[PDB]
């Protein structure tokens, strides 16, 4: 398994560029130059690279420096052919965003954050990004009395709808993807899980161009099923982008390589992205974006090892996932457990609530005790998946 650009593997500049400062220590690696990052990613088989405005252009850079940076960055894209499919804004590192960007209690920080986003959409358009991600990492609180909870959501809506109207107004070919996170850096973040994010989009004026950017480790921090969560987003037509990594449990965000966290969950994630639904339905066709960090204990050889590892993990899982579904023993196990039977409507074509109510066979003369003897054989069906995962079938 060697990745190729058709695999659609994209990586953020901040992933491989992560130098190692954590909350208990300083950087263990030297800064990575962005041009070197592009050359190196391209050589590993990456299709694209993504970034945050301040990942490339310093917060204080002059207009001269911005243009110098962009010129060399664009030259490296040209030299390699790496695309830039998603752009995002840093609304969390500088001290001004300590209470948030869009939901900052201070009004002058809310306008500064939103103006920073609007300018960044212009850069997104210019780079040819299809997706603009919004991760509201400082939107939230440590204490419950800190915020007017209704005002926080009106202010979040205002920012997202202003940005959305702006795209529509300039006719940029871009969609906004919100990225939910339960906590860290705030004690509680607004729109904590896939569900809150999706619910919030339905209250928006320009909801039609706003979708989601779920991250594996983020839903796992609330102990949620990531395949269940992305299935709902997909079902709603709202899975616009995805961030893949590993998390081992509810604890700080680890950002491990995809597959180095909950492996069985990683397998079924890949089955849903690659294979879709057993009875048919929607499919995710976007880039497979790795949002992780190379462990601070490792040197630059480990940084490129880790980038490679993300792509290998995905291709090994993909392989096992295609052999699993293709397996006739598996298809028959699925049929026994009622996987395809769930696809049939409960009601008959034209049957009404009254009809079903008044159908003695479905209720009054129904044998509940006979119906309960059914062996769904979910254990055996799970054993078949693990055996394909273990490369034993």
């Amino acid at each position: 398994v060697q990745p190729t650009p058709a695999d659609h593997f994209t990586f953020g500049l901040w992933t491989v560029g992560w130098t190692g400062a954590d909350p208990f220590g300083v950087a263990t690696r030297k800064n990575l130059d962005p041009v070197e990052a592009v050359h190196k990613l391209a050589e590993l088989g990456a299709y694209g690279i993504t970034f945050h405005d301040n990942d490339l252009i310093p917060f204080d850079a002059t207009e001269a420096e911005r243009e110098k940076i962009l010129g060399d960055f664009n030259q490296a894209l040209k030299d390699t052919g790496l695309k830039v499919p998603m752009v995002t804004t840093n609304l969390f590192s500088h001290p001004v965003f300590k209470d948030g960007g869009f939901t900052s209690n201070d009004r002058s920080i809310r306008r500064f954050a939103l103006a920073k986003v609007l300018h960044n959409i212009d850069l997104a358009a210019e780079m040819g990004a299809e997706t603009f991600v919004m991760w509201g990492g400082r939107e939230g609180s440590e204490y419950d009395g800190s915020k007017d909870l209704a005002a926080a959501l009106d202010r979040m809506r205002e920012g997202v709808d202003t940005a959305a109207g702006y795209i529509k107004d300039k006719g940029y070919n871009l969609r906004i993807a919100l990225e939910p996170k339960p906590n860290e850096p705030r004690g509680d973040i607004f729109l904590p899980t896939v569900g809150h994010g999706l619910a919030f989009i339905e209250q928006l004026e320009h909801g039609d161009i706003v979708g989601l950017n779920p991250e594996t480790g983020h839903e796992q921090m609330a102990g949620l099923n990531f395949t269940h969560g992305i299935a709902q987003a997909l079902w709603a037509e709202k899975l616009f982008h995805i961030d893949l990594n590993g998390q081992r449990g509810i604890k700080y965000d680890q950002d491990l390589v995809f597959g180095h966290g909950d492996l069985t969950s990683a397998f079924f994630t890949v089955d849903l992205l690659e294979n879709g639904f057993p009875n048919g339905g929607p499919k995710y066709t976007g880039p497979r974006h790795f949002d992780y960090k190379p462990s601070r204990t490792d040197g630059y050889d480990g940084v490129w090892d880790s980038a490679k590892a993300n792509m290998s993990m995905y291709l090994l899982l993909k392989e096992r996932a295609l052999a699993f579904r293709a397996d006739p023993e598996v298809q028959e196990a699925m049929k026994t457990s009622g996987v395809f039977e769930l696809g049939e409507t409960t009601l008959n074509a034209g049957e009404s609530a009254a009809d079903l109510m008044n159908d003695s066979a479905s209720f009054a003369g129904f044998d509940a005790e006979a119906a309960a003897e059914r062996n769904f054989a979910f254990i055996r069906l799970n054993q078949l998946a693990i055996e394909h995962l273990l490369g034993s079938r």
Copy 2:
């Protein structure tokens, strides 16, 4: 603090009626007769009682027995004046619901579950319930390959929309409230948090009459902020009912008395239900339903102690919450932290995205470093709330 019917304290028949069988042992108390339950609740100052169809009428009861039970149950309501504000269906105890009601892989169980719900709506209407709760406790899986995740949500939609159309069709004055739960009894339940529940309602044909029934302990099982979660439901106009109890951490569901779990969170929950939002907005006007279980170590004196305790806890918190907001030191602390400033729109009346972009004062000439020096004083504001909670101010 003595509760009165105007307090709107409702209790489920299964709460006080919980006999003590848990996963590791049998019942430690004798069955509680439902007529005795009504008489006793009414005497404690409860306004209403709620139940599950099989809490009152056995699954196997004949038509004769159903009518006998209802006649005595209605007589006790009459004798005491307790209302019945919410009715729900048991779609989880009998062995036929082992894979779920509405999302059961077996089609004949899906029709049986839905017919059971339709008949129960008819009883809800007859009792004068305003709300019909749907807790899909067996909808989900232990293993990821068990279900077609898109089919599971189409089947969930079908059941809820059939039930919704049925109410609309008979002109019952009822709303459906969905009750999200992350896990237990299933390893993963569909619509795990407030957010998934709200997102799901926007995909429904008859969404207009479907809202939520959040439970304190349920959101706390995913480590979520219950006040944040109910704030979003309220903001969306979807908080139709609420279940109050205590949970101490991510572990099995405890169902403790309200206030016996996360006390500081209980305080702010009460502040939101009683006081609403600091800048004004929506308010929750429904019943304050206690969904808990009296600890199995205690006898029937403890059962009535626990019921009383729920109402006392709420009234003590209420008191502290009204004194907290009324306090001029607190109102000034709030003003300093920007609680009211969050209420102001980011944009000026008529300002456009372009206008804000091109306003040098909000971006190009903005002093980010000056703006970052603001002491939001969130610590001090939190210390004032705890001091009111501790009854020291």
Copy 3:
């Protein structure tokens, strides 16, 4: 992968006999005859069977019944060749044990629990068991003021020391294994994790014959690394028994098949059991016991499938973990990362504290920034391990 009695797979009678009742619903399966379990387990490759006194002999059994039941069970054992390596006592099911056995607040109850345990030591002795397990499931509290925590540990000690002294006195070849568990059925359980279990053993008069019985799921219920916990028990030579199962996060105890929870963790537990420590150390040589529950969704084919799945899972992980450590590339990766270097003593032979502080090479002239450049290459070692787990190497 075909298990043979040489593998030492032991099963509890309660595992495959679990009937399917949980907190939200009734049993989905009929009771399992003990004779049948013995015969079925012997035909799958099991080595032995374990039980709780009440799994076999009802609480209320008359003497005649006890003899009968035991006659039936010993016959089965004689007929099949199964061993009985561990025997345990139920101090959790009867309503009298609602506050614990040993740490019950009621003294008369404490005395009955210990009496119930002493009698069970005789039985364990008679069955030829090597290990006697103590799972204090009801020892704990829901509320912090319910117990005097110093007196609960004194009471616990009294119980365990009385049982240990009695073993020594009777000259039985039995060791006690304490089984830690953090919560469920109680809100908080005493001796919640392997460390708390080991700490307590050191305060016991007869701690020489007292050790641990860690269970996979229990440790994962507190979010701890099961492999690290059994390494500490092994290290102190206190790993007397082990309970293998699966758990998919911090939630209710799932009791899934071994390997059906966290797969990589399972993989590394099998490497520790089979391969021991990279530098040498104690090795675990007891039964590999599965304490799980066949999902309640599955009927009786599922029950024997799930029993089988345990042993298959173990044998597949073992194949992989043996291949993993035998690989030259893996051994090279381990050397590079300093796995072997960890085994060298920090100090030199007869080097003292004063000798080392004084040594300029070690401190005063130690080049900290050049030392910090070492690429530990832990990511690459982890990728190598996963690739062996997926059977791609």
Copy 4:
């Protein structure tokens, strides 16, 4: 509530000196001069101050600088009267400690870490500290194959025993306190909880002078009951120090003010520290040390407010916990629940195992169903405690 030096409130220099940098953003506050901290802490009622060698003396400090800094700090101490009860070492910040100090895989690094600790014992000795804390923050792994777990505990033991022997050898009046932590900065940390800390002490050659330094938040990070964990440390006479702060669940370490996390748990920790065990037992008599961080949202008034809030929180809980145990109703409730009864030995004076099994009253003729009727009334005791906490009694 005004703290006085008699209260023994100690603060780390790093607590109020925390600058606000975290994993997603830069410092929000300027560095705090050590002299100022000392003077500010003395004016608020602090009793003492603690530090890490590098909080005070930079890593690269020349000798002249070290003398200067120490001259400045001892002057402050002399001027204010503050004590220095605990001194600790930073084995986590420099990039050389990326794999740990004591359990680093690199031997040269292990030797530097121990050398760095030995030198710091001299300094601790010179400052007049009673306790020397060891927080092994980088001891652990992200991945399961990174370490030989038996060799990591040998390496740890070597380090701690070398330090302990050296103390004994120099005749210093210092005790070592090990500080357990489950995760962060590493994915898994060695000796993760109070039980694991206590277990390890028992395998040490000089364990007589080695004890624990439990922190509130750390134990809550694994979801454990902090009050139960310090009761076990107390019970074994191993509670040498304590770190008080707040944590709002299983997530990143928050370091909130003491009482700003789980309030009821805090309440019961203060009852244990102040009131001791209901039946008598050891009492904790050391410093009440706050290891927290002023939220990064707050400016310097917030910093002194947060320092103040710690001591106010402690004094309010103490007032309440003293009132709680003095209440006649509460004492009556405790008797009823068997709190005092737990303290009576299970066996009778000179009663043996054989004596008890033989006793018909205790076993053979014990009426288990009548015993089971006892109403323990734990809910009512809990309601009583909360009412004292809320100041309504």
